[PDB]
C-alpha cells in the first residue's frame, strides 16, 4: 500500500497519442496530449515557483491545479471535466475513458475487430448446391484467396514470381483464363465460413466447400436457410477464410454444414425440409 500515492506519473507511448498531418495542413493528435502538457506545465511552474521564492498561498494554489491535472490524464470527470479550448465542450478522453468509456478498450475489445481475409455480398438460393458446398463468386474468391493464388501462379507457368503474379492481376482485363484454373485448383478441398446478420447461435456460422461461380451473388443452400434466419429479400452474408491447416481442419471437420444436422437446443433436426420441399413431398 505505499504505492497508492503518486509521485512518478507514467506517460503513455507517443505513437499512441499521435500528432498527424490531416488536410490542407490540418493536424490530429490524441486528446491525451493536451492533458499531458497540462501536468508538465504545472509540474514545471511548480518547481520554478519553489525555486524563485515561495509565497504559501501561491504554492498550494498551484499544487491544487497540479493535483487536478494528475487526475485528468488518469480519469476525467470524476472531479470536474477538462475541455479543449472553445470549440468542443468535450471531455478530453482520459486514460480511463480509454479503458472503459462509452466505447473504450476492453469494451470494443469485444464489440469487434476487422478480419483480414473477409468478404460480404448478397445471397441467393442455390437449389442444386448440396449442403456440403456453397456458391462463391470467383471474383470474390480471387481477392479472398489472393496469396494462395499468387504462389500457385508461380508453381505453374502463368507467372515468374509473386510481384509478377501481383501486377498480372492488378487490372481486370489482364487476367488470362489460366488464372481461374489456378484459383479453382487452390480452392480444391479448402472451405470457408459464411455468417448471417444476427449470429444468434453457433449455427449462425457454417462451413462449406466453395464452388466458384459467375457474377456478384453468393449461392446458399436452401436447407441451412433455417439455421441462419436468412430469407432472400436482400439479406447479405459475410464470408471468412480458414488460413491455418489447423483452422481449416476444425472448420471442415467440426464446423462444416453437412455435419451439424441436429440442433444443440433440441435433439430435433434443423435440416428439416423447409417450405418448398414439404409442399412438394406432401402433394
Amino acid at each position: 500500500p505505499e504505492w497508492m500515492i503518486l509521485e512518478a506519473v507514467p506517460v503513455l507511448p507517443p505513437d499512441l497519442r499521435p500528432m498527424v498531418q490531416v488536410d490542407g495542413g490540418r493536424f490530429a493528435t490524441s486528446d491525451l496530449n493536451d492533458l499531458y502538457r497540462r501536468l508538465i506545465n504545472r509540474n514545471n511552474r511548480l518547481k520554478k515557483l519553489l525555486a524563485q521564492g515561495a509565497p504559501e498561498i501561491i504554492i498550494r494554489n498551484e499544487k491544487r491545479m497540479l493535483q487536478e491535472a494528475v487526475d485528468a490524464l488518469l480519469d476525467n470527470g470524476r472531479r470536474g471535466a477538462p475541455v479543449t479550448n472553445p470549440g468542443s465542450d468535450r471531455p478530453l478522453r482520459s486514460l480511463t475513458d480509454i479503458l472503459s468509456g462509452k466505447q473504450g478498450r476492453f469494451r470494443q475489445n469485444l464489440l469487434g475487430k476487422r478480419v483480414d481475409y473477409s468478404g460480404r455480398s448478397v445471397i441467393v438460393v442455390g437449389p442444386q448446391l448440396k449442403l456440403h458446398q456453397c456458391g462463391l463468386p470467383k471474383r470474390m474468391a480471387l481477392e479472398l484467396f489472393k496469396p494462395f493464388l499468387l504462389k500457385k501462379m508461380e508453381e505453374k507457368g502463368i507467372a515468374p514470381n509473386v510481384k509478377a503474379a501481383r501486377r498480372m492481376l492488378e487490372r481486370q482485363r489482364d487476367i488470362k483464363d489460366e488464372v481461374w484454373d489456378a484459383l479453382e485448383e487452390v480452392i480444391h478441398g479448402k472451405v470457408v465460413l459464411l455468417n448471417r446478420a444476427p449470429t444468434l447461435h453457433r449455427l449462425g456460422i457454417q462451413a462449406f466447400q466453395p464452388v466458384l461461380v459467375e457474377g456478384q451473388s453468393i449461392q446458399l443452400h436452401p436447407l441451412v436457410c433455417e439455421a441462419f434466419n436468412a430469407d432472400f429479400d436482400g439479406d447479405q452474408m459475410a464470408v471468412h477464410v480458414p488460413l491455418s491447416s489447423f483452422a481449416q481442419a476444425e472448420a471442415r471437420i467440426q464446423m462444416l454444414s453437412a455435419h451439424n444436422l441436429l440442433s444443440p437446443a433440441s435433439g430435433e433436426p434443423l435440416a428439416k425440409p423447409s417450405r418448398d420441399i414439404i409442399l412438394g413431398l406432401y402433394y
Binding site: 498561498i57 498550494r60 494554489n61 491545479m65 487536478e68 470536474g80
Partner: peptide
C-alpha cells in the same frame, strides 16, 4: 469543491 472560489477567497 470548485477551484477558483477557494483560491480567490484564500488570498483575498
Amino acid at each position: 469543491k470548485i477551484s477558483t472560489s477557494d483560491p480567490v477567497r484564500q488570498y483575498l
